[PDB]
Each structure stands twice: as structure tokens, then as C-alpha cells.
Amino acid sequence: GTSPTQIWCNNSQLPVDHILAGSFETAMRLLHDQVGVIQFGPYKQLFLQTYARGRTTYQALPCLPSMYSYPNRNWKDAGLKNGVPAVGLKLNDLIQRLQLCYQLTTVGKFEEAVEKFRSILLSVPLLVVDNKQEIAEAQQLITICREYIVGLCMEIERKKLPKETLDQQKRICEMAAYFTHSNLQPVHMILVLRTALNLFFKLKNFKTAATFARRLLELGPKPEVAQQTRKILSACEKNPTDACQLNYDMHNPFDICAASYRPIYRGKPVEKCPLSGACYSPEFKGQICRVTTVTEIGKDVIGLRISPLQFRL
Amino acid sequence: DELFDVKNAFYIGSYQQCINEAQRVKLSSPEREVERDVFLYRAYLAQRKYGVVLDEIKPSSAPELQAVRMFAEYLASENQRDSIVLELDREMSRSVDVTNTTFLLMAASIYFHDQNPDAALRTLHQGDGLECMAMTIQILLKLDRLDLARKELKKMQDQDEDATLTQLATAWVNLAVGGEKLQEAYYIFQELADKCSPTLLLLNGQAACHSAQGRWETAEGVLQEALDKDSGHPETLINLIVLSQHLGKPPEVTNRYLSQLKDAHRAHPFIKEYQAKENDFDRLAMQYAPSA
């Protein structure tokens, strides 16, 4: 007859369903078309893990091979024909993990934070989502992950680059400033602003520093920080002026190149990761996304398909 | 039936109980004595004490025992298997004897492992016994032809509704059916455990029923109890891995059970499949991966 796993495959477009089924090739294809995922290698743990949960086992008779049971999320209604695998991974689970990521960011554990963030980001396509808004949250969740990943990754590099040349220094300040734009939560956003302010201050680009200081204050950082910020701000006011011109436009909209960590203003051509939304300069197109690590930058895709609602007829 | 307790203990899954009782029972008949020995060894096979069966059953033993021993060697020696099947094929074709039910069951069992469902089913077709019917249904379920399975079940159902063997069979069909049926399967497993005794087999069956339905948490107790009795029990560990993920246990937990399974039985087909999946995944990765 037809195996239950096969039934699941026939029944659902969702990639997780196929993984549960054990149909890797099918699942990979779905991930490849719906999302960009060219490089499956980072996926392997997720697949096996997901795969393991798919079916239960019980023994009909002794000394014979054990039987397998396939749980269905719609067990009641599903007949033999319309079964679909039980869930097992949910949006809340992913959201919960996010806090741990936040914690690591605050501590300065950025490298570890990236891993957790990326782990969640990759996991999003696995989900089966019940309602339309819930789908939006998933998309939003992914966005948050890339934002941190690119931002944190940019930060790690900035620290690495050499301080010695003036040009080198200008580069650092620029990158620090770029971080400012990243959409993080206020606790983190404040932290980055704090950093940028100092770099700009030493740079003697006081005018720009003043703007950062004001933005920081609005956030409402702890009192000690706020006081320090006010102190710096007043100093900046004495000589509001930027000594050097930097390749940074606070006002102009940006898009940080995930690879280059260079600004891409407004309209200027950009290539984006189908999955993450990470942005890259046109040169990168066709390459593996640094943020996602699985995806192809240039790839056009159907789009994430977490819920059956997405399919319409 | 004098043997009733011994056999019943066997089907439920409490092998040791079967063995103990088998010894206590008195022969009272050359026929019965043979049946008793058959179950006694069958129990040892369940236990995986192959050596016991191979050593003790000797050529002089009754043909029924011989069949059991045949199965034992098949399980025990991987190398021997092709040779055994070949001989089995020869014996099956070159010899009519239907009467030996034990032979049919053992032979069918070998075919089943051989993954020659047709042959096993073919053999079982000849056998009249109630057990033969139960085995037949099980094979049909694996075949995923629930419909055929249902027919056999009723067939046995007419003969003996109350028999535990029949009840187990119904539960199986039941579990396959899905839906409201699942609850029915759950009760039968529960009732058996209550009456006879919770066996690892029975506990997992209950767990499977609960898991089929959403009730992951309810499943926890049965698996936990089963695990306590026997770590390394294949069905239990597998169920635990599945259960753990639904519960939201830490990923390490799922991994731990999986590793534990490997320790208990490197060979276990679940493990093999897992490995197989890993292999093709790597294979697939190369397919998608960019060239360099």
C-alpha cells in the first residue's frame, strides 16, 4: 500500500513535514526552491534531529521486527489518505531561545550569540505555523536574527582591524557608526551608541559625536551612562565640528553589506539573501550568504512557506 | 488449555514469566511436552539468548524444536542466513507438510526478516492456527494494506474474540487505523497490563497510543517506568527520543537517548537507518553544493 511517510510527503509542501518523513531529497528541494538554501551542510544536524522524532515504535509480536507508528497532527480527521505529521517545533520555542541570544549579546559573548542567532534563523523554515499573523512573527523573527548577526559580525571585525593608520581609524569609526543603524533592542542599541560616541570623540569628529550622544540619551540608558554621555556631549558642543569627512551618512538610508560592511545607500543596487534579507553589494551575487551560510545571495525564490495558509486555490 | 498461561505470558512480552511457568508445567502428553518446549525456547529467543536455544536443541529433538532452532541460528549467525533461507526454500517447496504449525511460524518468521513478505505470507496462508492469523495480520500491516489486515482480524475475531492474541491483533490494526480507534488500542494495552502485568512490550504499546494522540505528557510515565526496568530497550529509547522533542527537553536529551541506543544495540535497524540517512544527506549536500 502507500506508506504513511509517503502520504505526508504527498500531503504537505512544508519542508519540516518532509524531513519528518525522511524524504531528505524532497525536503532539500523544497528548501532550495522556497528559500535559497544551496548549502545544506549546516542543516545536517537539524535534519537528523527532526528525522529522529518522526515515528514511534511498538512491538506487535515477539521476536519479530517492531512496528512503527506515525503520529499525525490532524490525527482525528486524517484518514489513511490525509494524514500529516505532528508538529514538534513551534514558534514560541524559537522565540524563547532568542532571549538567550540577547543575554549573550549583553555579556559580550557575540561569537556565541551569532551561533544561537543563526541556529534560530535556520530553524524558522522548519516551523509549521497556524495563523497568518504567526507567519509574520516568523518573518520578523528571522529579520531580528540577521540584524544581530550582521551587526555583531561587523563588530567583531572592526575590533580586529588595525588602529594605526588615520585611514585605518576612519575605517573603524565608520564601521562603528554603521552598527548604530542596526535595528537591535534598546539595551544593545545603547551599548553600540556608547561605543560609537567614544570613537568619534577621539576622532575629533565632535559634530557627529553630538548626534550619537543625543540619540543615546533618548534611549534612557542607566544613570551613570547618561551622566557620562551628557559630559561628552557638552564637550562636543564647545567645538561642534567634524575634523574629517567620513563615508557615513546618518540621514541617508543604509543597507549594510554583510560581507564588506560598507554602506549601500537607498536605491543603489543590492543583492539580498532570499531567506535572511541580508544585503550584499552586487559583486557578491551568486555567493553563499555569510549570515545564513546556507543560502545563495542572487537566488530568486518562491519564499518561505511555513503554513499551508500560504497555498491558495 | 494447560499451556494457556505459558503461551499467554509469551505473547504479552513477559518472557521470563513464560520461561518460569513453562518449567513448572508438567508434560502430561508427548504432544504438550513438545509445545511447552517450543514456547520455552521461543521465550529464550525473545530474550536473545540464542546460545541457549542452539546448544540445547539437538538434532534428536522434535521437528517443532528443530524449526525453532532454525530460526535461532538465523538470528544468531548473520553469515548462515543466506544458506538457511536457501535450505528453507528447498524444504518449503520440496515438502508439503502443513500440519507442523510451528514450522510454518518459524519459517514465516525467517522470511519476514529476510524481507520476503510474500514468502512468509505464502507460508502463513497454509497454517490454520490462530497465531498464524495474528502473524498474518502483522505482516499485512507492515505492508500497509490495512484493508487486508481488517479481513484477517475479523477472521480471527469470529474464532476467538476474547483471546489475548486476538486482542493484541485488534490493537495493532487499531493503531494503524488512526482516529478514534487509537483510544480503543490504548485500552486494550492498558487492560492487558493491568490484568497480566506491565511488560515492556505493553508499556510501549500504551505509550504509542498516547503519542499517536496529542498526549505526549501522558506518555511520559509509561516510558519512564519502562526505562527504569530496562535501559537499552530499543522501543523505549526510540520513543523517548521522540517524546523528548515534543516535551521540549534539551536537545542533549534526545541525543543522549540516541547514543544510549547505540550502546545497547549497535546493530538495531533504527540505528542503521539513522546512519543511512546521514549518508544520503552528505550525498545530497554534494549534489547541491557549489563546485570548487
Numbering used by the authors:
A (entry chain A): 913 to 1225
B (entry chain E): 17 to 308
Original paper wording:
The linkage structures are at lower resolution than that of the leaf, so we fitted our leaf structure as a rigid body to assess which subunits are close to one another in the linkages. While the contacts formed by these proteins at the linkages may play a regulatory role, they are therefore not essential for COPI function. The slightly improved resolution of the linkage structures obtained here compared to our previously published maps showed that the density that we interpret as being contributed by a flexible hydrophobic loop of the N-terminal β-propeller of α-COP, is in the vicinity of γ-COP in a neighbouring triad. We found that βArf1 is close to the N-terminal β-propeller of β’-COP in a neighbouring triad, and approaches the trunk domain of β-COP. While the low-resolution of the linkage structures precludes more detailed interpretation, the proximity of the peripheral βArf1 molecule to neighbouring triads suggests that βArf1 could modulate inter-triad interactions.
Arf1-GTP recruits the protein complex coatomer from the cytoplasm and anchors it at the membrane.
